[PDB]
Write a protein that binds this DNA or RNA. Structure first.
Ligand SMILES: [Cl-]
Ligand SMILES: [Cl-]
Ligand SMILES: [Mg+2]
Ligand SMILES: [Mg+2]
Ligand SMILES: [Mg+2]
Ligand SMILES: [Mg+2]
Ligand SMILES: [Mg+2]
Ligand SMILES: [Mg+2]
Ligand SMILES: [Mg+2]
Ligand code: NA
Ligand code: NA
Ligand code: NA
Ligand code: NA
Ligand code: NA
Ligand SMILES: [Sr+2]
Ligand SMILES: [Sr+2]
Ligand SMILES: [Sr+2]
Ligand SMILES: [Sr+2]
Ligand SMILES: [Sr+2]
Ligand SMILES: [Sr+2]
Ligand SMILES: [Sr+2]
Lengths: 160, 140, 186, 154, 95
RNA sequence: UUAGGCGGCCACAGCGGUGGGGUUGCCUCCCGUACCCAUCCCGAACACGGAAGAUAAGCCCACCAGCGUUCCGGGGAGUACUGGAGUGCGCGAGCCUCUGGGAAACCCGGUUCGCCGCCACC
RNA sequence: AGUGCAAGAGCAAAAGAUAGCUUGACAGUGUUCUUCCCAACGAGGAACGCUGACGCGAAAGCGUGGUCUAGCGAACCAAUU
RNA sequence: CCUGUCAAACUCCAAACUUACAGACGCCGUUUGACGCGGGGAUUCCGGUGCGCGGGGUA
C-alpha cells in the first residue's frame, strides 16, 4: 500500500483502544539503540533528524528508517560501539482501509502511524566527536525511507 | 500533664469467630454480660453463601467488667512485642482484644464537633506495653 | 488536600457542627428557627432568621442570665432548660416574632429531653411552634422533681455548693412565676 | 474623530458587516462619514476594517471636503461659509471643522447630511486587495495618508 | 444526535466541576425572588429536582410568579415565548 | 469572641508542624447512672445528673510553607490557537501578511496556614 | 464502593448500608415544558401546583414508584368499575 | 528516581468565538405606523458553487 494513502493528517485522531479492536502489531523492533545502559549526557555530540513537514509515518516506515540507520551505526561502530540512538515517536494513530461500493464504507483496521509535526526530532543520536560523521550518514539513509524532507541538525557540537 | 496522659482501658472485646452460636453461653459466663451475634459479608465457597447469618459472637466490656476480666484473662497469655498494635492495642488468643487509649478519647467518639485524635495523643506500643506490664505481668 | 481534584467538605461540615440536610428541610418552612443548644453546664435558646450574609439572631436566652431573675441553682438541667426557652421565647415575642420551627442541631430527639423542654418553654411564652405533646417530659420532671427524689437517696448532698440540701423544684415555680409576669425587664 | 470611506462594494461582503456600514450612515462606495472615537464606534470601524479606509484628517483637509461635498439634511442648497453661518452654531466651515474634529457636534446636529458623497480618487487609489502597511488603501491611515485620499476624492 | 431524549448531549452542562461535587449549599435553594426580577437559569448538577429542560441552560428570564415553591420564569426561546417552572436552586439573580 | 452559639462564601479555609492559654467565669476533657432516654452486648455512644480533678485532647490565640490550593510579578509568550480581510507564497498536505483577540504546561520570586455577617459575653 | 439493566450524569451525618415501620406504585383536577430547538402537530413522558385521603417523623419535612435520561400504542369494538 | 511518547467516544487547565438579558451609542418607527396581532392568496419541501469548520472514502 502506497504511503500517499496515509501520509497526511486529514482525519480525526483515531487512537482509543477501548473502542478499536484488531489493531495489527507494530513492526518497530526497538526505540532505544546503542548502549542504553549509559546516559545521553555522557556524550559530547548530539545529532537529531528533524522532519520538515507535518506528516504521518506508518510503523513500517519507522522500522525501515530506524533499521537502515542503526544498521549503519553498527557496521561502522560495531555491535557495541560507544553511541546511543533514540526513535522518540510511537505510532498511536490507527489506520483504516475500505477493502460493496461506497456503501457502509468505514474501513477495516490495517495499521498504525506516528503523527510528526514539522520541525520535530524523529531520531536523536549521541556520539563521540569521532563518529559524528557516521551518525550523519546513518541519518542520510534513514530520511530516504520516510515521506518528508529532513534536516540533520547537530545539537551539542562546537567541534567544527 | 501526666494525669490526663496516663493510659486506660476503653474496651475489652471477647469473641469467638466460629463459622455457623451455641458458644454464646460460655462467653456469657467468662465475661459477665450478654454476647452479640456476628453476621458475615460476601459469599464464600466454603459453604458460606448466606450473607446475613450467625457465624460468631462477641462481648464488649468497659470499666470494671473489663478489668475483672483481664485480671484472670491476661495470666492466660504470653504477651509479646509483635502482638501489639501501632496504636497501642493488643489482642491474644477465642480472641481477646484490649483497646487502650488516653483520657479524652470521647473527642473522636461523640456526635457533635467530634475530631480525630492528634498523633501526639495517640497511645504508642511502647507506652502501651509499659502501662500493661506495669500491672500484673511481663512483656515480650 | 491530596490534589486538585480533592473535595473538601464545607467548613461547618468538617467542624462537624452543621447538618446541612436537616438545615435545608428546616429552612423550607419559611419560619424562624428556635435554635436549641446545650453545653455540659449551660443551655442556650436562639430565634434565628435567614440573612444575606449569614443567619440573624432576633432574640435569645442563655441559662446563665437566668440568675439575673433569681436563680441560684445549677444551669444544666431540665428546669434550667425549660425556663431558658421561655425567657428566649418571651424576648422573641417582644421583637415581633410569633412562630418558629425547632432546630435541635446535632442533638437527639429523645423523648422528654432538654431541647424539647426548651421547646415547651418557648411555646408557653406564646410562640407558635409545630410540636408533639407526647414527646415532652411530664410536668414534674420539667420542674426538676426527678432531681429532688434523687437527693432523697441522700447520705451525701447532691449539690456540692450549698444551694440547699433537698433541692427545690418550687424555686423553678418562683422563677417561671416571675417570668410569666409582665413587669420583668427582658 | 476618524473619517470613514467605503472603498469596497456590498457584493459578497458579510451581511453583519454591511449593516454596520449602514448604521454608520454609509450606503455607497466612495461615501464618507465622520465618526467620534468612542469604544462603541471603535468596534464598528474595526469590524468594517477590510472594506473601508479611515483615519483622522487634518483641519484643512476636513475643510476642503466639507466645502466641496457637505450637504443639507434636505435640498440642493450649496454649503459654504454663508450657509454654515446662517444655519449652524458656527461662523464658517472652519468653526464646524474644528468642532467636528474635537467631537463637540455632528453633521446631523447642524442640519447637515451625515454623509459626504465623495468623487472617485483622482489618479486612482492604492488598491482594495491590500492594507496600508502592504501598499494598499484599506484600513487605518496616517493623517497624511487620509488627507491624500480625501483630497484626491474632493 | 443518535437519540432524542431530554439529556441528549448534556454531558458537560450537567456535570459538576470536581470541586463543586457533593450536596450544594441550602442558601440558594431557599432564596426568594420577586415578580419582575431577572434571573439566570443554570441547572445545579447536584440538585435532582426542580430542573427545567437543559436546552434552556443559560437563559436570563423574568420571574412572574410562582407555583408552590417553584418559580414561573418567562423566557423567549428563539422567537417563541415560554414559561419555565424552576426552583431557586437552579436560579441566580442577574447583576 | 481570656476559650461561646447560629451561619454566609465553601481548601485563600486542605495536609503536616511549632509555641501559648484557663480557682468559684466560658468551652471541653472530666465525675457519675436514681430519673427521661439508650446500647440487636456494652452510661462507648445517645440521654440524664453533676463539679473532685485538668489544660494532656479538643477548642481558642500566635505562628511555620514542606505537600495541596488562590491570586500576583517576571520569563515562557503576544508564543500555541483564533474572529475579519487578501489576484500573498506553496505541486500539494499547508503557510504567510494586515486587522481584532489571545492561552496551557513549566521555571523563578511573592501571596495564601481563611475572609465576612448576626447574636451573646470582663 | 454501592445505587436492578446501556452509556453519560447525580449522590457520603446520603440518593449508599442495616433495622424497623409502611403502602404516596393513592383518588380528583390543573400549570408548564417536552414530544415537535427556532415553529404548527397526537399518544406518550417529566417538572411543578391545588383538592381529597393516608404513611412515617419530635418537627420542619419527605412520599404524585425505582437518583436522572429507554421500558411504548389512534378510531371502531368488547370486557370491566 | 531518571528517561521516551499519546487520545473522536481523557481532562488539573483553557481561548478566539457563539449565545441569554440589560444599559449606552448607532440605525429605525410614531402622516412612510415600526414591534405585535387576526385573516385571504400562494409558491416551495430534486438544489448547486466558493470560503470556513467538518465526518466517510486512496481519491
Ligand atoms: Cl449543642
Ligand atoms: Cl422547561
Ligand atoms: Mg439630498
Ligand atoms: Mg492594483
Ligand atoms: Mg463535549
Ligand atoms: Mg498544650
Ligand atoms: Mg498557487
Ligand atoms: Mg381496526
Ligand atoms: Mg377487559
Ligand atoms: Na449491498
Ligand atoms: Na444474627
Ligand atoms: Na454541588
Ligand atoms: Na487544651
Ligand atoms: Na402529551
Ligand atoms: Sr478527510
Ligand atoms: Sr524523504
Ligand atoms: Sr465514662
Ligand atoms: Sr503532488
Ligand atoms: Sr491584548
Ligand atoms: Sr425521583
Ligand atoms: Sr457553535
Amino acid at each position: 500500500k502506497p504511503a500517499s494513502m496515509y501520509r497526511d493528517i486529514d482525519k480525526p485522531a483515531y487512537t482509543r483502544r477501548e473502542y478499536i479492536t484488531g489493531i495489527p502489531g507494530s513492526k518497530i523492533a526497538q526505540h532505544k539503540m546503542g548502549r542504553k545502559q549509559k546516559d545521553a549526557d555522557d556524550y559530547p555530540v548530539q545529532i537529531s533528524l528533524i522532519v520538515e513537514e507535518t506528516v504521518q509515518l506508518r510503523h513500517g516506515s519507522l522500522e525501515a528508517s530506524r533499521l537502515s540507520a542503526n544498521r549503519h551505526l553498527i557496521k561502522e561502530l560495531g555491535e557495541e560501539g560507544d553511541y546511543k540512538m533514540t526513535l522518540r515517536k510511537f505510532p498511536h494513530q490507527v489506520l483504516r482501509e475500505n477493502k460493496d461500493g461506497m456503501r457502509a464504507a468505514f474501513g477495516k483496521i490495517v495499521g498504525t502511524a506516528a503523527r510528526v509535526q514539522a520541525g520535530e526530532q524523529l531520531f536523536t543520536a549521541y556520539c563521540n566527536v569521532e563518529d559524528a560523521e557516521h551518525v550523519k550518514e546513518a541519518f542520510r539513509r534513514a530520511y530516504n525511507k520516510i515521506t518528508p524532507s529532513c534536516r540533520i541538525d547537530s545539537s551539542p557540537a562546537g567541534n567544527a | 500533664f501526666h494525669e490526663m496522659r496516663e493510659p486506660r482501658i476503653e474496651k475489652v472485646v471477647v469473641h469467638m469467630g466460629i463459622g455457623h452460636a451455641n458458644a454464646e453461653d460460655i462467653l456469657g459466663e467468662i465475661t459477665g454480660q450478654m454476647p452479640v451475634r456476628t453476621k458475615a459479608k460476601r459469599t464464600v465457597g466454603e459453604f458460606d453463601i448466606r450473607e446475613g447469618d450467625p457465624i460468631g459472637a462477641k462481648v464488649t466490656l468497659r470499666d470494671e467488667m473489663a478489668e475483672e476480666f483481664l485480671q484472670t484473662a491476661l495470666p492466660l497469655a504470653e504477651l509479646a512485642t509483635s502482638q501489639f498494635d501501632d496504636t497501642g492495642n493488643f489482642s491474644f488468643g477465642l480472641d481477646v482484644t484490649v483497646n487502650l487509649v488516653r483520657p479524652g478519647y470521647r473527642v473522636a467518639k461523640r456526635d457533635k464537633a467530634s475530631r480525630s485524635i492528634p498523633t501526639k495523643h495517640r497511645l504508642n506500643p511502647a507506652d502501651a506495653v509499659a502501662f500493661i506490664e506495669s500491672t500484673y505481668d511481663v512483656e515480650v | 488536600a491530596t490534589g486538585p481534584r480533592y473535595k473538601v467538605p464545607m467548613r461547618r461540615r468538617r467542624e462537624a457542627r452543621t447538618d446541612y440536610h436537616q438545615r435545608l428541610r428546616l429552612l423550607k418552612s419559611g419560619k424562624p428557627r428556635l435554635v436549641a443548644r446545650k453545653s455540659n453546664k449551660h443551655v442556650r435558646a436562639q430565634l434565628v432568621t435567614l440573612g444575606p450574609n449569614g443567619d440573624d439572631t432576633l432574640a435569645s436566652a442563655h441559662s446563665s442570665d437566668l440568675a439575673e431573675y433569681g436563680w441560684e441553682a445549677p444551669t444544666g438541667n431540665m428546669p434550667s432548660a425549660y425556663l431558658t426557652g421561655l425567657l428566649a421565647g418571651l424576648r422573641a415575642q417582644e421583637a415581633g416574632v410569633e412562630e418558629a420551627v425547632l432546630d435541635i442541631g446535632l442533638n437527639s430527639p429523645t423523648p422528654g429531653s432538654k431541647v424539647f423542654a426548651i421547646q415547651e418553654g418557648a411555646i408557653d411564652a406564646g410562640l407558635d411552634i409545630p410540636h408533639n405533646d407526647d414527646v415532652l417530659a411530664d410536668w414534674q420532671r420539667t420542674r426538676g422533681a426527678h432531681i429532688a427524689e434523687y437527693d432523697e437517696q441522700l447520705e451525701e448532698p447532691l449539690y456540692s455548693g450549698d444551694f440547699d440540701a433537698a433541692d427545690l423544684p418550687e424555686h423553678f415555680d418562683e422563677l417561671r412565676e416571675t417570668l410569666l409576669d409582665g413587669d420583668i425587664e427582658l | 474623530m476618524h473619517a470613514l470611506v467605503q472603498l469596497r462594494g456590498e457584493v459578497n461582503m458579510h451581511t453583519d458587516i454591511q449593516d454596520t456600514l449602514e448604521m454608520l450612515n454609509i450606503h455607497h462606495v466612495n461615501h464618507c462619514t465622520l465618526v467620534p472615537e468612542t469604544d462603541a464606534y471603535r468596534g464598528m470601524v474595526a469590524k468594517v476594517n477590510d472594506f473601508v479606509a479611515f483615519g483622522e484628517p487634518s483641519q484643512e483637509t476636513l475643510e476642503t471636503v466639507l466645502a466641496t461635498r457637505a450637504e443639507p439634511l434636505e435640498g440642493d442648497a450649496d454649503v459654504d461659509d454663508e450657509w454654515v453661518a446662517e444655519h449652524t452654531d458656527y461662523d464658517d466651515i472652519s468653526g464646524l471643522a474644528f468642532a467636528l474634529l474635537s467631537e463637540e457636534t455632528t453633521l446631523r446636529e447642524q442640519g447637515l447630511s451625515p454623509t459626504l458623497r465623495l468623487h472617485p480618487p483622482r489618479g486612482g487609489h492604492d488598491g482594495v486587495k491590500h492594507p496600508v502597511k502592504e501598499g494598499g488603501q484599506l484600513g487605518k491611515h496616517d493623517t497624511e495618508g487620509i488627507d491624500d485620499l480625501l483630497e484626491a476624492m474632493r | 444526535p443518535s437519540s432524542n431524549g431530554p439529556l441528549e448531549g448534556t454531558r458537560g452542562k450537567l456535570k459538576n466541576k470536581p470541586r463543586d461535587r457533593g450536596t450544594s449549599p441550602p442558601q440558594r435553594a431557599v432564596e426568594e425572588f420577586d415578580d419582575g426580577e431577572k434571573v439566570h437559569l443554570k441547572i445545579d448538577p447536584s440538585v435532582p429536582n426542580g430542573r427545567f429542560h437543559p436546552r434552556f441552560d443559560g437563559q436570563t428570564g423574568t420571574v412572574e410568579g410562582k407555583q408552590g415553591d417553584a418559580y414561573k420564569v418567562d423566557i423567549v426561546d428563539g422567537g417563541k415565548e415560554k414559561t419555565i417552572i424552576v426552583t431557586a436552586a437552579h436560579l441566580r439573580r442577574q447583576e
